[PDB]
C-alpha cells in the first residue's frame, strides 16, 4: 500500500512537494505532550540514578524536552504529509470513476416505512 506512490523517489523523508502543507504551529498540543514525555523521561532518569529528582534537572530536563520537541516535530510534519497524500488519492480516484461509486439521490423521510415496535 502506497509504496507505488513513494517508491518513485525512495527514502525521501518528506518530498519537496510537502512544503505546500501548513506546518504544525508551535503550541500544537501533540508536540507539547511530547515535551511532557521528555519531562517524565528525565524524571525516570533521575529516579534511576539514586539522586533525588528535581536535582540535576536544570540542564538534563531541558535536554530531554527539547530533543523530543525536535524529533516529534519532524514526525508530526511528515505525518500530516502522509494523510494529505492519502486524502488526495481518495478524491482523485473518486472523480475519475463515475460507475464504481454511484451518486444516489437521498430521498426524504416523506417516503420511508419502518416497523418500530413500541414498548407495549
Amino acid at each position: 500500500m502506497m509504496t507505488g506512490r513513494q517508491a518513485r523517489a525512495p527514502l525521501q523523508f518528506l518530498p519537496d512537494e510537502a512544503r505546500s502543507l501548513p506546518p504544525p504551529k508551535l503550541t500544537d498540543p501533540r508536540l507539547a505532550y511530547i515535551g511532557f514525555l521528555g519531562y517524565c523521561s528525565g524524571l525516570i532518569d533521575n529516579a534511576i540514578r539514586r539522586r533525588p529528582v528535581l536535582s540535576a534537572g536544570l540542564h538534563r530536563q531541558f535536554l530531554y524536552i527539547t530533543s523530543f520537541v525536535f524529533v516529534g516535530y519532524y514526525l508530526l510534519k511528515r505525518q500530516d504529509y502522509m494523510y494529505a497524500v492519502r486524502d488526495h488519492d481518495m478524491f482523485s480516484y473518486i472523480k475519475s470513476h463515475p460507475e464504481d461509486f454511484p451518486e444516489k439521490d437521498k430521498k426524504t423521510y416523506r417516503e420511508v416505512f419502518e416497523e418500530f415496535h413500541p414498548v407495549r
Binding site: 437521498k106 430521498k107 426524504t108 423521510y109 420511508v112 419502518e114 418500530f116 413500541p118 414498548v119 407495549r120
Partner: protein, 171 residues
C-alpha cells in the same frame, strides 16, 4: 394577574349574611380584629416594597422559537437539517406536556369548586379532558426511552396505515 380565560374563575356567588338569631359574634370579633391586626401591618409593608420595586423597572421577555421544515424536508441522513427539526419537535412536545398539565389542573379545581355536585358542572371540562388526553394518548404515548421524530412520524405512519385498512373494510 394570570390570563383569565385560560384558568376560569366562575361567578363568586357569595351569599348574604343573615344573623337570624341574636347572639354573640364569635368569629366576627376576630375577623375584624384580624383585619385590624394582620391586614394593615402587612399591607403597609407590601405596598412599601411595591413602590421600592416600581422606582426602577425591568423588562424581561418570553422567548420565541421560529418554525422550520421539521421532519419532512430532511433527507434520510445528513443530520445538519435533522437536528433543528427533531429538537424543536422536543420543544413542542414539552409544550404539549404543559397543556396536559393545564387541563388536568382545571379538572381538579373544578371538582373542588363544585362541592358535592361532582358530576354537575364538570361534564364539559372533563369532556374536553378526555378529548385532549385521548389525543396525547394516541400520539406520544408508547415510544420508549429513546425517541426523537423518526419514532413519532413512525407511529403516525402506523396509524395511517391501520386506518387505511380500516377504511377499506369500511366499504
Amino acid at each position: 394577574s394570570w390570563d383569565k380565560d385560560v384558568y376560569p374563575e366562575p361567578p363568586r356567588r357569595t351569599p348574604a349574611p343573615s344573623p337570624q338569631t341574636s347572639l354573640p359574634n364569635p368569629i366576627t370579633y376576630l375577623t375584624k380584629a384580624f383585619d385590624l391586626l394582620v391586614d394593615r401591618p402587612v399591607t403597609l409593608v407590601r405596598e412599601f416594597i411595591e413602590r421600592q420595586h416600581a422606582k426602577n423597572k425591568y423588562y424581561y421577555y418570553h422567548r420565541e422559537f421560529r418554525r422550520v421544515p421539521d421532519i419532512t424536508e430532511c433527507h434520510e441522513k445528513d443530520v445538519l437539517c435533522m437536528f433543528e427539526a427533531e429538537m424543536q419537535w422536543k420543544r413542542d412536545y414539552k409544550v404539549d406536556q404543559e397543556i396536559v398539565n393545564i387541563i388536568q389542573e382545571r379538572l381538579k379545581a373544578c371538582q373542588q369548586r363544585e362541592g358535592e355536585s361532582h358530576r354537575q358542572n364538570c361534564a364539559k371540562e372533563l369532556q374536553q379532558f378526555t378529548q385532549v388526553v385521548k389525543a396525547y394518548q394516541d400520539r406520544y404515548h408508547d415510544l420508549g426511552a429513546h425517541y426523537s421524530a423518526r419514532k413519532c412520524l413512525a407511529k403516525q405512519k402506523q396509524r395511517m396505515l391501520a386506518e387505511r385498512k380500516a377504511t377499506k373494510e369500511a366499504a
